[PDB]
Amino acid sequence: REHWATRLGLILAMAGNAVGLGNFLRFPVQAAENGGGAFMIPYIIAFLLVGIPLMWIEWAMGRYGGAQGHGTTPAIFYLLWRNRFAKILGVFGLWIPLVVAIYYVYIESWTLGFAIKFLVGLVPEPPPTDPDSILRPFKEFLYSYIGVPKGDEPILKPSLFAYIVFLITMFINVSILIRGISKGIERFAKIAMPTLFILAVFLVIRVFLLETPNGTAADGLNFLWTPDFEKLKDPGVWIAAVGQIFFTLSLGFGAIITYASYVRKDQDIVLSGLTAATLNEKASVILGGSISIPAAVAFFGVANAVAIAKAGAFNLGFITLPAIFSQTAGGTFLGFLWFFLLFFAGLTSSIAIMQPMIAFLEDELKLSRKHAVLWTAAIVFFSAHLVMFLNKSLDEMDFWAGTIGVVFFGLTELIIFFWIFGADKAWEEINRGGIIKVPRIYYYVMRYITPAFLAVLLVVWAREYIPKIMEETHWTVWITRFYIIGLFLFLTFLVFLAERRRNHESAGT
Ligand SMILES: CCCCCCCCO[C@@H]1O[C@H](CO)[C@@H](O)[C@H](O)[C@H]1O
Ligand SMILES: CCCCCCCCO[C@@H]1O[C@H](CO)[C@@H](O)[C@H](O)[C@H]1O
Ligand SMILES: CCCCCCCCO[C@@H]1O[C@H](CO)[C@@H](O)[C@H](O)[C@H]1O
Ligand SMILES: CCCCCCCCO[C@@H]1O[C@H](CO)[C@@H](O)[C@H](O)[C@H]1O
Ligand SMILES: CCCCCCCCO[C@@H]1O[C@H](CO)[C@@H](O)[C@H](O)[C@H]1O
Ligand SMILES: CC(C)C[C@H](N)C(=O)O
Ligand SMILES: [Cl-]
Ligand code: NA
Ligand code: NA
């Protein structure tokens, strides 16, 4: 089996795994929609009560599984719980990263696409003061690119350039993943990460220098870092904060697990898991949070920033922020740095969410790494046409695999590892090989607090939120719903073939 070559590569591969588009696109929207400083409180607690503990658990499962030649959850879930239902529950660990991959890679490609058009200076030319005459040319720039519907039909019509950049993007993902852990994901993570850090620093600095009749970047920082204890009681704020902790630290995607399974059996995972998590939360709160919001608040003042955040998720990153940059000298280049930064951030995270399925085709179905990568690209590339041409298809997947799936799977891997497998055997397994050990208090946060926190979350969710989505959506949602349910049975079928081949291989030995 393959292993990470250096302690550094591993840590940067894991930090690039987590540090993605969620840090620079999702976090900003989420923190502003949810009252700025009023979101930061739950977010910090959630990081201490859910974030860190699950990070460790997944590394643990990962290294544990990897040692015995398995890097995915259908296998590993069976090793922790010798039951047929563990393989099935373990499927979600290939399903989630696959579905998410299907729409992540596409979005990631956009940034490449925009990155290229801003470099070359093929970008809208806003008429040099009216906020709309400026924002509109860019709304149309995005709307043309991805192909937003103009009439009554839920049909996206992607530009050709977009489509072909989606090919290159796939190609670029494959060229890394096909070289493997150490010579691919690892070699790349050592270049990407520093680059990502520099670009973001440069942007953060340049943004801090923004001033307008309407404010300064400072006002954005205040808005973001001013406590509002009159929300703490809002369950929407806690479901917001926790949903953001998961996505950002790649928990419940089975990606941490799969990566971790390339960690040598003896290698520490306590100081490593802790370093990777702490990297993702700096990049998140220090960098991601100091680019979008400050710039928006500095040009529009807070009241309008918030209104934009709520407008959509991509309004800020793909429309507002470029439009703002366009009102500054070389703001086109700056735009390119902005998108070139996003790209690398989405590239390092998309290679991560595609490795689970790969690791399964090699591990369980004994395919070469090459065929594994190729087929995994074909499944994602084919399926991505759904996302490309079906309006709000992305939104549906991001909900079932990227929102509901992750939380349910997180609680699930926690209940299998710490409750079924064994709390003590889990503790012993997490701490084993550590450079540092785990704060004794955390044992009790993992065994009682965490699972009760989440369990409650999911309960409120299934009551005060999910009924609206099942009933108040358009009818096309049932196409994607049909498709991603179809993917699950397919995965369920390979898990079936894999256990069969194993039976034939045990008999033939
Ligand atoms: C392998 C599965 C293929 C199924 C259908 C392929 C559709 C390709 O369609 C292409 O996409 C672009 C985006 O709008 C357009 O620019 C092109 O004119 C079009 O040929
Ligand atoms: C990284 C390289 C990507 C290049 C792919 C070219 C995409 C083809 O796109 C075409 O180009 C023209 C001009 O820009 C437009 O007039 C056409 O409407 C468009 O279909
Ligand atoms: C459920 C998802 C199905 C994806 C199949 C999409 C097939 C591509 O469809 C084609 O693409 C072009 C661009 O919009 C159009 O010019 C063509 O008229 C259309 O035939
Ligand atoms: C479910 C997602 C799939 C979206 C595909 C959108 C493509 C729209 O393409 C349409 O297809 C028809 C059938 O060949 C043609 O008769 C139409 O002229 C054409 O506009
Ligand atoms: C509710 C979760 C809070 C997490 C913060 C934990 C900080 C570490 O806590 C420390 O770790 C040591 C080992 O267990 C103890 O010896 C110390 O008394 C303690 O101060
Ligand atoms: C699906 C994961 C790779 C997402 C990643 N943690 C991000 O914040 O973008
Ligand atoms: Cl985050
Ligand atoms: Na990333
Ligand atoms: Na992240």
- DSSP track, 54-99: HHHHHHHHHHHHHHTT--SHHHHHHHHS-SHHHHHHHHHHHHHHHH
Cα atoms in the Cβ-side hemisphere of radius 13 Å centred on 333: 7
- Residue 436 Cβ < 6 Å to ligand 5: no
Which residues, other chains included, contact 384 with Cβ-Cβ below 8 Å and sequence gap of 6+? 102, 103, 105, 106, 166
Quickly count: other Cβ atoms within 10 Å of residue 492's Cβ: 15
How far from 368 is each of 68, 129, 360, 374, 376, CA to CA, in Å? 18, 59, 11, 10, 12
The C-alpha atoms of residue 474 and residue 334 are separated, in whole angstroms, by 38
Q: At 400, is the secondary structure helix, strand, or coil?
A: helix
Atom 9 of ligand 6, nearest CA residue: 20
Using the mean position of ligand 6's atoms as its centre, give its distance from the Cα of residue 175 in Å: 20
Beta bridge partners of residue 211, listed in sequence order: 216
CA of 10 to the centre of ligand 1 (A): 38
Q: How far is 358 from 464, CA to CA, in rounded Å?
A: 37
Token pair in block for residue 377: 């690209």
Pocket test for ligand 1, best of 110, 150, 163 (most atoms within 8 A of CB): 163
> CA-to-CA distance for 458 and 387, rounded, in angstroms?
26
Q: How far away, in angstroms, is 315 Cα from ligand 4 center?
A: 27
Distance 106 CA to ligand 1 centre (A): 14
Nearest to 379 by CA among 275, 247, 235, 484: 484
Within a 13 Å sphere around the CA of 324, how many CA atoms are in the beta-carbon half? 31
Cα 104 to ligand 3 centroid, rounded to whole Å = 20
Beta strands in 328-479 (DSSP E): none
Q: Give the separation between CA 231 and CA 52, rounded to whole angstroms.
A: 24
CA distance 449 to 51: 12
Q: At what angle do helices 187-208 and 7-18 cross, to 10 degrees?
A: 50
DSSP sequence for 104-122: HHHHHHHHHHHHHHHHTT-
| Partners of 212 in beta bridges | 215
Residue 439 beta carbon below 6 angstroms from any ligand 5 atom: yes
In sequence order, which residues have a C-beta less than 8 Å from that of residue 265 and are 6 or more positions away?
63, 66, 67, 433
Contact predicate 301/308, CB 8 Å: no
Residues 6+ apart with CB under 8 A from 456: none
Q: 263: alpha, beta or left, given left = phi > 0 and alpha = psi -120 to 50?
A: beta
Nearest alpha carbon to residue 421 among 431, 411, 432, 429: 429
What is the spatial distance between Cα 371 and Cα 378, in angstroms, rounded to a whole number? 10
- Please give the Cα distance from 437 to 451 (Å, whole number): 22
Which numbered atom of ligand 5 lies nearest the CA of 449? 1
**How many C-beta neighbours within 10 Å does residue 473 have?**
15
CA distance linking residue 47 with residue 41, whole number of Å: 10
First to last CA, the chain: 20
Residue 347 burial (10 A CB sphere; 0-12, 13-18, 19+): buried
By alpha-carbon position, which residue is closest to atom 19 of ligand 2? 160
Q: Which of 441, 442, 444, 445, when mutated, tests ligand 5's pocket best, judged by the most ligand atoms within 8 Å of its CB?
A: 441
Alpha-carbon span 108 to 123, nearest angstrom: 19
d(CA 416, CA 488): 20
Closest to 350 measured CA to CA, from 194, 173, 115, 471:
173
State in Å: Cα 384 to ligand 5 middle.
45
β-strand partners of 215: 212
> Experimentally, how was this structure solved?
X-ray
Written as one letter, the residue type at 169 is T
In angstroms, the CA 135 to CA 141 distance is 10
Residues with CB under 6 A from ligand 1: 157-158, 160, 163, 382, 385
Residue whose C-alpha is closest to residue 17's, from 435, 306, 351: 351
Closest C-alpha to 351, from 19, 110, 33:
19
Q: How far apart are CA 145 and CA 114, in angstroms?
A: 9
What gap in Å lies between CA 374 and CA 362, rounded to an integer?
Answer: 12
Identify whether the C-beta of residue 217 lies closer than 8 Å to the C-beta of residue 209.
yes
Q: Which of 85, 123, 170, 29 is nearest to 339 (CA)?
A: 123
User: Which residue from 313, 298, 332, 340 is spatially nearest to 207, judged by alpha carbons?
Assistant: 298
For atom 13 of ligand 5, the residue with the nearest CA is 439
Q: Binding site for phosphocholine: residue ranges?
A: 84
Q: How far is it, in rounded angstroms, from Cα 281 to Cα 18?
A: 9
For 215, the enclosing helix (H) or strand (E) is strand 215-216
